[PDB]
Every structure is written in structure tokens, then in C-alpha cells.
Amino acid sequence: GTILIDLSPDDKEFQSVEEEMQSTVREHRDGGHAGGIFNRYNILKIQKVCNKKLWERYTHRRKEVSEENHNHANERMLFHGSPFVNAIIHKGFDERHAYIGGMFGAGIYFAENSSKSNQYVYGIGGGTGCPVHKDRSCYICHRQLLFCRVTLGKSFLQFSAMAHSPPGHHSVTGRPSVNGLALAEYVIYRGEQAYPEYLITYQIMRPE
Ligand SMILES: COC(=O)c1ccc(-c2nc3ccccc3c(=O)[nH]2)cc1
Ligand SMILES: [Zn+2]
């Protein structure tokens, strides 16, 4: 029951999603190995993801979290990149979208930096890059990210360079403790704590 509504580039909603995408690009310590070398994107399309059942699944869990945390869902908008973006927008997040080997355990990972999620578009560590050219830095092939509504609730703060949340918590925050420019990354351990609200289709752009 998923439908995708195209946003117009003239729509304020397109513009504010694009701005979060572009303004949260940063350099990565791999020099571009996983995600490619770029400072910015060419945004090709932004679609709103509409699925009543998945939305209601999300809001149900959100109310549960909120009631366990002084009526505060601690809701954020966060990026997710995955080879499984098409399964996600149709069937929702679940345990098959978890990063089993992630540093905060087997859960579903999200980033404030769009460029961090870009590193997973073609798999962990960028996999073998784009299907057509086997290039992790492909400037031709169309990529997709999700910009998601995520319920964090009471988040366990991990300072740092499916499983369950830590007891008494609804999520984990990976707080960057070395790279002064990196934004936070977050993990949830229940697929119902995220809704894939925008599907963004883009290319990374070769620096001039
Ligand atoms: C089951 O699919 C995967 O193995 C997988 C692994 C990692 C990711 C992913 N891992 C992140 C880690 C930190 C910050 C952001 C992300 C993200 O957007 N995707 C997505 C899918
Ligand atoms: Zn390619």
C-alpha cells in the first residue's frame, strides 16, 4: 500500500529536505573509499512515502515510547542508506535491515550526516560500488537515501571514536569523541521506531 508522491523543486518541503541533505555533507576519514569523493549532491528527485499501515505502526510505537519517557518521543529526522531502500519503503523497517556488525550492536542505524548514510547505499563499506560500473565513487549512477522520522525516546549516550536497547533505554546515540566535525549516529532496535518519510534520488558530484 505504499505510494510515492513527487515533490516539486518549488515546494518548500522539497527545499528544506534538499538543504538538510546538502548541508550535512562532511569529509570522511576513509578519504572517500566507501561513499565516494564529493562535497555536494545533484538532487534528482524527492518523493514523499505514503503508507497508512506503516505510519500507524510508527505512531503506535511512538506513543508507547512517549508514555515511558515523560511524554517525550525524542523524535528526530535522520538519514538512512541501505541496499534495501526498496524493501523498506514497501514493507517498513525490520530485523533484515539491521547492521548486524555495527559498533553499537545489531540494530538499524541512522545518521545526521547524509554523507555518512551515503557510505551504505551500495552496502557495508560501500560494497563493490555501483552495480553498473563497480565504482564506489560513481558520478553517473543514481543513488537513493531515506530521510526518516525516528523515535529515540530515552537514548543511551555512547562516547566513541536484533539486540535490545540497553535496559531502561529506547535507542543508542553514538556521540563522536575524536572527529570534531562528525555529527551523531543513532541506533534503534525496533523497526517500528522509524518511518521512511522521504525517498531522495541523487548523484554525488565530482569536485571542481
Ligand atoms: C542489512 O543491511 C545492512 O547490512 C546495512 C548496514 C548498515 C547500514 C547503515 N549503517 C549506518 C551506520 C551509521 C550511520 C548510518 C548508517 C546508515 O544509513 N546505514 C544499512 C544497512
Ligand atoms: Zn555507476
PDB file of C-alpha atoms and ligand atoms in Angstrom:
ATOM      1  CA  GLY A   1       0.000   0.000   0.000  1.00  0.00           C
ATOM      2  CA  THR A   2       2.932   2.360  -0.445  1.00  0.00           C
ATOM      3  CA  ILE A   3       2.509   5.282  -2.794  1.00  0.00           C
ATOM      4  CA  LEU A   4       5.250   7.781  -3.745  1.00  0.00           C
ATOM      5  CA  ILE A   5       4.296  11.419  -4.271  1.00  0.00           C
ATOM      6  CA  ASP A   6       6.825  13.523  -6.142  1.00  0.00           C
ATOM      7  CA  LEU A   7       7.603  16.859  -4.598  1.00  0.00           C
ATOM      8  CA  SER A   8       8.119  19.849  -6.837  1.00  0.00           C
ATOM      9  CA  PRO A   9      11.500  21.626  -6.556  1.00  0.00           C
ATOM     10  CA  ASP A  10       9.366  24.770  -5.978  1.00  0.00           C
ATOM     11  CA  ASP A  11       7.817  23.254  -2.819  1.00  0.00           C
ATOM     12  CA  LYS A  12       9.185  24.493   0.488  1.00  0.00           C
ATOM     13  CA  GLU A  13       9.177  20.891   1.653  1.00  0.00           C
ATOM     14  CA  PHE A  14      11.476  19.842  -1.258  1.00  0.00           C
ATOM     15  CA  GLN A  15      13.707  22.756  -0.458  1.00  0.00           C
ATOM     16  CA  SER A  16      14.078  22.059   3.242  1.00  0.00           C
ATOM     17  CA  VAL A  17      14.786  18.306   2.688  1.00  0.00           C
ATOM     18  CA  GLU A  18      17.347  19.216  -0.006  1.00  0.00           C
ATOM     19  CA  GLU A  19      19.027  21.678   2.358  1.00  0.00           C
ATOM     20  CA  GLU A  20      19.352  19.043   5.153  1.00  0.00           C
ATOM     21  CA  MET A  21      20.851  16.682   2.566  1.00  0.00           C
ATOM     22  CA  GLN A  22      23.442  19.187   1.217  1.00  0.00           C
ATOM     23  CA  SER A  23      24.307  20.956   4.469  1.00  0.00           C
ATOM     24  CA  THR A  24      25.152  17.744   6.335  1.00  0.00           C
ATOM     25  CA  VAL A  25      27.838  16.558   3.873  1.00  0.00           C
ATOM     26  CA  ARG A  26      31.237  16.177   5.592  1.00  0.00           C
ATOM     27  CA  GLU A  27      34.635  14.638   4.788  1.00  0.00           C
ATOM     28  CA  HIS A  28      35.077  11.028   5.956  1.00  0.00           C
ATOM     29  CA  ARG A  29      38.206   9.508   7.499  1.00  0.00           C
ATOM     30  CA  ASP A  30      38.346   6.966   4.654  1.00  0.00           C
ATOM     31  CA  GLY A  31      39.179   9.733   2.148  1.00  0.00           C
ATOM     32  CA  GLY A  32      36.065   8.730   0.165  1.00  0.00           C
ATOM     33  CA  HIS A  33      36.730   4.989  -0.049  1.00  0.00           C
ATOM     34  CA  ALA A  34      33.212   3.851   0.950  1.00  0.00           C
ATOM     35  CA  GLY A  35      30.977   6.622  -0.289  1.00  0.00           C
ATOM     36  CA  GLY A  36      32.953   8.479  -2.945  1.00  0.00           C
ATOM     37  CA  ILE A  37      34.702  11.822  -3.247  1.00  0.00           C
ATOM     38  CA  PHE A  38      32.253  14.760  -3.269  1.00  0.00           C
ATOM     39  CA  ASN A  39      31.297  17.918  -1.399  1.00  0.00           C
ATOM     40  CA  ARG A  40      27.729  18.075  -2.583  1.00  0.00           C
ATOM     41  CA  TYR A  41      24.964  16.270  -4.432  1.00  0.00           C
ATOM     42  CA  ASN A  42      22.881  16.667  -7.551  1.00  0.00           C
ATOM     43  CA  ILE A  43      19.392  16.117  -6.230  1.00  0.00           C
ATOM     44  CA  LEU A  44      17.309  14.432  -8.952  1.00  0.00           C
ATOM     45  CA  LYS A  45      14.033  13.731  -7.130  1.00  0.00           C
ATOM     46  CA  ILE A  46      12.411  13.882  -3.704  1.00  0.00           C
ATOM     47  CA  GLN A  47       9.354  11.712  -3.066  1.00  0.00           C
ATOM     48  CA  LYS A  48       7.089  11.544  -0.063  1.00  0.00           C
ATOM     49  CA  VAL A  49       6.499   7.969   1.072  1.00  0.00           C
ATOM     50  CA  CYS A  50       2.856   7.350   1.957  1.00  0.00           C
ATOM     51  CA  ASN A  51       1.746   4.113   3.622  1.00  0.00           C
ATOM     52  CA  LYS A  52      -1.085   4.248   6.149  1.00  0.00           C
ATOM     53  CA  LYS A  53      -0.342   0.915   7.798  1.00  0.00           C
ATOM     54  CA  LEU A  54       3.371   1.665   8.226  1.00  0.00           C
ATOM     55  CA  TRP A  55       2.628   5.172   9.538  1.00  0.00           C
ATOM     56  CA  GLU A  56       0.138   3.820  12.070  1.00  0.00           C
ATOM     57  CA  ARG A  57       2.691   1.184  13.143  1.00  0.00           C
ATOM     58  CA  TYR A  58       5.188   4.029  13.710  1.00  0.00           C
ATOM     59  CA  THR A  59       2.735   6.313  15.649  1.00  0.00           C
ATOM     60  CA  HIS A  60       1.616   3.417  17.862  1.00  0.00           C
ATOM     61  CA  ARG A  61       5.184   2.703  18.901  1.00  0.00           C
ATOM     62  CA  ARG A  62       5.888   6.450  19.254  1.00  0.00           C
ATOM     63  CA  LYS A  63       3.037   6.811  21.787  1.00  0.00           C
ATOM     64  CA  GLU A  64       4.367   3.851  23.728  1.00  0.00           C
ATOM     65  CA  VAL A  65       7.871   5.355  23.900  1.00  0.00           C
ATOM     66  CA  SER A  66       6.494   8.814  24.772  1.00  0.00           C
ATOM     67  CA  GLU A  67       4.465   7.437  27.669  1.00  0.00           C
ATOM     68  CA  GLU A  68       7.586   5.696  29.014  1.00  0.00           C
ATOM     69  CA  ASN A  69       9.607   8.982  28.786  1.00  0.00           C
ATOM     70  CA  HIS A  70       7.567  11.839  30.325  1.00  0.00           C
ATOM     71  CA  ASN A  71       5.527  12.328  27.156  1.00  0.00           C
ATOM     72  CA  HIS A  72       8.663  12.896  25.047  1.00  0.00           C
ATOM     73  CA  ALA A  73       9.218  10.720  21.966  1.00  0.00           C
ATOM     74  CA  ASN A  74      12.508  12.497  21.242  1.00  0.00           C
ATOM     75  CA  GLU A  75      11.706  12.378  17.570  1.00  0.00           C
ATOM     76  CA  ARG A  76      14.365  13.276  15.001  1.00  0.00           C
ATOM     77  CA  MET A  77      14.720  13.397  11.201  1.00  0.00           C
ATOM     78  CA  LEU A  78      17.699  11.280  10.191  1.00  0.00           C
ATOM     79  CA  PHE A  79      19.267   9.756   7.097  1.00  0.00           C
ATOM     80  CA  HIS A  80      19.357   6.084   6.287  1.00  0.00           C
ATOM     81  CA  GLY A  81      21.304   4.485   3.378  1.00  0.00           C
ATOM     82  CA  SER A  82      20.891   0.802   2.512  1.00  0.00           C
ATOM     83  CA  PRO A  83      20.911  -1.632  -0.383  1.00  0.00           C
ATOM     84  CA  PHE A  84      17.363  -2.387   0.842  1.00  0.00           C
ATOM     85  CA  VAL A  85      15.708   1.037   0.447  1.00  0.00           C
ATOM     86  CA  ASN A  86      13.065  -0.525  -1.871  1.00  0.00           C
ATOM     87  CA  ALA A  87      12.078  -3.235   0.598  1.00  0.00           C
ATOM     88  CA  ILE A  88      11.983  -0.564   3.353  1.00  0.00           C
ATOM     89  CA  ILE A  89       9.589   1.846   1.649  1.00  0.00           C
ATOM     90  CA  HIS A  90       7.196  -1.040   0.818  1.00  0.00           C
ATOM     91  CA  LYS A  91       7.365  -3.249   3.916  1.00  0.00           C
ATOM     92  CA  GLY A  92       8.801  -0.993   6.659  1.00  0.00           C
ATOM     93  CA  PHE A  93      11.959  -1.354   8.737  1.00  0.00           C
ATOM     94  CA  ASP A  94      12.549  -4.726  10.382  1.00  0.00           C
ATOM     95  CA  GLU A  95      15.384  -7.017  11.570  1.00  0.00           C
ATOM     96  CA  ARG A  96      16.572  -7.682   7.983  1.00  0.00           C
ATOM     97  CA  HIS A  97      17.577  -4.000   7.692  1.00  0.00           C
ATOM     98  CA  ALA A  98      19.792  -4.169  10.817  1.00  0.00           C
ATOM     99  CA  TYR A  99      23.550  -3.682  10.672  1.00  0.00           C
ATOM    100  CA  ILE A 100      24.443  -6.940  12.420  1.00  0.00           C
ATOM    101  CA  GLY A 101      28.096  -5.964  12.796  1.00  0.00           C
ATOM    102  CA  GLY A 102      27.574  -2.348  13.881  1.00  0.00           C
ATOM    103  CA  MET A 103      29.590  -0.825  16.715  1.00  0.00           C
ATOM    104  CA  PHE A 104      26.500  -0.408  18.870  1.00  0.00           C
ATOM    105  CA  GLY A 105      25.228  -3.918  18.219  1.00  0.00           C
ATOM    106  CA  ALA A 106      22.759  -5.398  15.808  1.00  0.00           C
ATOM    107  CA  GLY A 107      20.212  -2.625  15.178  1.00  0.00           C
ATOM    108  CA  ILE A 108      19.068  -0.210  12.496  1.00  0.00           C
ATOM    109  CA  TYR A 109      21.467   2.716  12.086  1.00  0.00           C
ATOM    110  CA  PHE A 110      20.743   6.359  11.189  1.00  0.00           C
ATOM    111  CA  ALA A 111      22.971   9.446  10.629  1.00  0.00           C
ATOM    112  CA  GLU A 112      22.713  13.256  10.983  1.00  0.00           C
ATOM    113  CA  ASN A 113      25.339  13.414   8.229  1.00  0.00           C
ATOM    114  CA  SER A 114      23.800  12.471   4.876  1.00  0.00           C
ATOM    115  CA  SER A 115      27.314  11.682   3.680  1.00  0.00           C
ATOM    116  CA  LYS A 116      27.612   9.004   6.390  1.00  0.00           C
ATOM    117  CA  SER A 117      24.434   7.215   5.139  1.00  0.00           C
ATOM    118  CA  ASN A 118      25.731   7.612   1.578  1.00  0.00           C
ATOM    119  CA  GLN A 119      28.559   5.198   2.563  1.00  0.00           C
ATOM    120  CA  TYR A 120      25.977   2.372   2.841  1.00  0.00           C
ATOM    121  CA  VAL A 121      23.916   2.937  -0.323  1.00  0.00           C
ATOM    122  CA  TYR A 122      25.856   0.096  -2.056  1.00  0.00           C
ATOM    123  CA  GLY A 123      26.311  -1.969   1.116  1.00  0.00           C
ATOM    124  CA  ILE A 124      28.594  -2.036   4.173  1.00  0.00           C
ATOM    125  CA  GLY A 125      31.776  -0.122   3.389  1.00  0.00           C
ATOM    126  CA  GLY A 126      30.219   0.768   0.051  1.00  0.00           C
ATOM    127  CA  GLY A 127      30.265  -2.900  -1.069  1.00  0.00           C
ATOM    128  CA  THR A 128      31.620  -3.153  -4.609  1.00  0.00           C
ATOM    129  CA  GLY A 129      30.175   0.218  -5.596  1.00  0.00           C
ATOM    130  CA  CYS A 130      27.514   0.854  -8.212  1.00  0.00           C
ATOM    131  CA  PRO A 131      26.073  -2.237  -9.963  1.00  0.00           C
ATOM    132  CA  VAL A 132      26.848  -0.895 -13.480  1.00  0.00           C
ATOM    133  CA  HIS A 133      30.470   0.259 -13.081  1.00  0.00           C
ATOM    134  CA  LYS A 134      31.579  -1.330  -9.759  1.00  0.00           C
ATOM    135  CA  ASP A 135      32.597   2.167  -8.631  1.00  0.00           C
ATOM    136  CA  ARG A 136      32.009   3.398  -5.032  1.00  0.00           C
ATOM    137  CA  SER A 137      32.644   6.883  -6.259  1.00  0.00           C
ATOM    138  CA  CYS A 138      30.385   6.606  -9.341  1.00  0.00           C
ATOM    139  CA  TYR A 139      29.286  10.091 -10.522  1.00  0.00           C
ATOM    140  CA  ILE A 140      26.836   8.642 -13.102  1.00  0.00           C
ATOM    141  CA  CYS A 141      24.628   6.123 -11.354  1.00  0.00           C
ATOM    142  CA  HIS A 142      21.519   7.290  -9.456  1.00  0.00           C
ATOM    143  CA  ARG A 143      21.630   6.714  -5.727  1.00  0.00           C
ATOM    144  CA  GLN A 144      18.859   6.763  -3.144  1.00  0.00           C
ATOM    145  CA  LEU A 145      18.708   7.677   0.564  1.00  0.00           C
ATOM    146  CA  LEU A 146      15.826   7.764   3.025  1.00  0.00           C
ATOM    147  CA  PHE A 147      15.269  10.785   5.224  1.00  0.00           C
ATOM    148  CA  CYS A 148      13.388   9.203   8.120  1.00  0.00           C
ATOM    149  CA  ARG A 149      11.327  10.052  11.157  1.00  0.00           C
ATOM    150  CA  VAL A 150      12.950   8.252  14.055  1.00  0.00           C
ATOM    151  CA  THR A 151      11.768   7.876  17.665  1.00  0.00           C
ATOM    152  CA  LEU A 152      14.719   7.861  20.026  1.00  0.00           C
ATOM    153  CA  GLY A 153      12.982   8.057  23.379  1.00  0.00           C
ATOM    154  CA  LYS A 154      15.465   7.766  26.223  1.00  0.00           C
ATOM    155  CA  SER A 155      18.716   7.348  24.312  1.00  0.00           C
ATOM    156  CA  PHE A 156      21.801   5.650  25.752  1.00  0.00           C
ATOM    157  CA  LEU A 157      24.810   8.009  25.137  1.00  0.00           C
ATOM    158  CA  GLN A 158      27.917   6.249  23.941  1.00  0.00           C
ATOM    159  CA  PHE A 159      31.039   8.369  23.570  1.00  0.00           C
ATOM    160  CA  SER A 160      33.145   6.795  20.820  1.00  0.00           C
ATOM    161  CA  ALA A 161      35.849   7.166  18.207  1.00  0.00           C
ATOM    162  CA  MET A 162      18.427  -7.634  16.648  1.00  0.00           C
ATOM    163  CA  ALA A 163      19.928  -6.785  20.013  1.00  0.00           C
ATOM    164  CA  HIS A 164      17.799  -4.987  22.611  1.00  0.00           C
ATOM    165  CA  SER A 165      18.209  -1.383  23.661  1.00  0.00           C
ATOM    166  CA  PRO A 166      20.159  -1.063  26.868  1.00  0.00           C
ATOM    167  CA  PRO A 167      17.850  -1.649  29.852  1.00  0.00           C
ATOM    168  CA  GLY A 168      15.821   1.474  30.576  1.00  0.00           C
ATOM    169  CA  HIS A 169      16.548   2.975  27.083  1.00  0.00           C
ATOM    170  CA  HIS A 170      14.802   3.078  23.671  1.00  0.00           C
ATOM    171  CA  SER A 171      17.861   3.743  21.491  1.00  0.00           C
ATOM    172  CA  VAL A 172      21.620   4.320  21.425  1.00  0.00           C
ATOM    173  CA  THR A 173      23.365   7.591  20.424  1.00  0.00           C
ATOM    174  CA  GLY A 174      26.879   7.284  19.061  1.00  0.00           C
ATOM    175  CA  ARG A 175      28.480  10.584  20.069  1.00  0.00           C
ATOM    176  CA  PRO A 176      31.618  11.397  18.114  1.00  0.00           C
ATOM    177  CA  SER A 177      34.664  11.717  20.516  1.00  0.00           C
ATOM    178  CA  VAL A 178      37.637  12.310  18.105  1.00  0.00           C
ATOM    179  CA  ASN A 179      36.446  13.800  14.774  1.00  0.00           C
ATOM    180  CA  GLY A 180      35.340  17.240  15.803  1.00  0.00           C
ATOM    181  CA  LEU A 181      33.314  17.657  12.586  1.00  0.00           C
ATOM    182  CA  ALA A 182      31.295  14.427  12.653  1.00  0.00           C
ATOM    183  CA  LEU A 183      27.652  14.542  13.593  1.00  0.00           C
ATOM    184  CA  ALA A 184      25.893  11.950  15.752  1.00  0.00           C
ATOM    185  CA  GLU A 185      24.731   8.492  14.623  1.00  0.00           C
ATOM    186  CA  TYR A 186      21.838   6.630  16.232  1.00  0.00           C
ATOM    187  CA  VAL A 187      20.627   3.055  16.596  1.00  0.00           C
ATOM    188  CA  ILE A 188      17.128   1.664  17.216  1.00  0.00           C
ATOM    189  CA  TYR A 189      16.389  -1.971  17.958  1.00  0.00           C
ATOM    190  CA  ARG A 190      12.779  -1.997  16.722  1.00  0.00           C
ATOM    191  CA  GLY A 191      11.731  -1.265  13.149  1.00  0.00           C
ATOM    192  CA  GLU A 192       8.521   0.367  14.337  1.00  0.00           C
ATOM    193  CA  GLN A 193      10.614   3.245  15.741  1.00  0.00           C
ATOM    194  CA  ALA A 194      11.312   4.656  12.278  1.00  0.00           C
ATOM    195  CA  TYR A 195       9.138   5.766   9.363  1.00  0.00           C
ATOM    196  CA  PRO A 196      10.813   6.262   5.914  1.00  0.00           C
ATOM    197  CA  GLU A 197       9.250   9.613   5.121  1.00  0.00           C
ATOM    198  CA  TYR A 198      11.256  10.822   2.078  1.00  0.00           C
ATOM    199  CA  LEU A 199      12.962   8.893  -0.738  1.00  0.00           C
ATOM    200  CA  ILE A 200      15.739  11.055  -2.173  1.00  0.00           C
ATOM    201  CA  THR A 201      17.261  10.175  -5.550  1.00  0.00           C
ATOM    202  CA  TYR A 202      20.635  11.828  -6.258  1.00  0.00           C
ATOM    203  CA  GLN A 203      24.084  11.710  -7.706  1.00  0.00           C
ATOM    204  CA  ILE A 204      27.255  12.617  -5.857  1.00  0.00           C
ATOM    205  CA  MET A 205      29.054  15.420  -7.700  1.00  0.00           C
ATOM    206  CA  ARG A 206      32.729  15.371  -8.714  1.00  0.00           C
ATOM    207  CA  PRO A 207      34.588  18.267  -7.041  1.00  0.00           C
ATOM    208  CA  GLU A 208      35.789  21.032  -9.420  1.00  0.00           C
TER     209      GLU A 208
HETATM  210  C1  LIG B   1      21.006  -5.315   6.447  1.00  0.00           C
HETATM  211  O1  LIG B   1      21.592  -4.207   5.745  1.00  0.00           O
HETATM  212  C2  LIG B   1      22.895  -3.790   6.173  1.00  0.00           C
HETATM  213  O2  LIG B   1      23.727  -4.672   6.398  1.00  0.00           O
HETATM  214  C3  LIG B   1      23.116  -2.334   6.492  1.00  0.00           C
HETATM  215  C4  LIG B   1      24.228  -1.977   7.233  1.00  0.00           C
HETATM  216  C5  LIG B   1      24.436  -0.660   7.614  1.00  0.00           C
HETATM  217  C6  LIG B   1      23.543   0.338   7.179  1.00  0.00           C
HETATM  218  C7  LIG B   1      23.731   1.747   7.606  1.00  0.00           C
HETATM  219  N1  LIG B   1      24.605   1.907   8.603  1.00  0.00           N
HETATM  220  C8  LIG B   1      24.827   3.119   9.169  1.00  0.00           C
HETATM  221  C9  LIG B   1      25.755   3.272  10.189  1.00  0.00           C
HETATM  222  C10 LIG B   1      25.948   4.536  10.748  1.00  0.00           C
HETATM  223  C11 LIG B   1      25.211   5.616  10.261  1.00  0.00           C
HETATM  224  C12 LIG B   1      24.287   5.496   9.215  1.00  0.00           C
HETATM  225  C13 LIG B   1      24.064   4.276   8.667  1.00  0.00           C
HETATM  226  C14 LIG B   1      23.114   4.025   7.524  1.00  0.00           C
HETATM  227  O3  LIG B   1      22.460   4.966   6.995  1.00  0.00           O
HETATM  228  N2  LIG B   1      23.013   2.772   7.065  1.00  0.00           N
HETATM  229  C15 LIG B   1      22.409  -0.044   6.445  1.00  0.00           C
HETATM  230  C16 LIG B   1      22.203  -1.379   6.100  1.00  0.00           C
HETATM  231 ZN    ZN B   2      27.934   3.621 -11.859  1.00  0.00          ZN
END
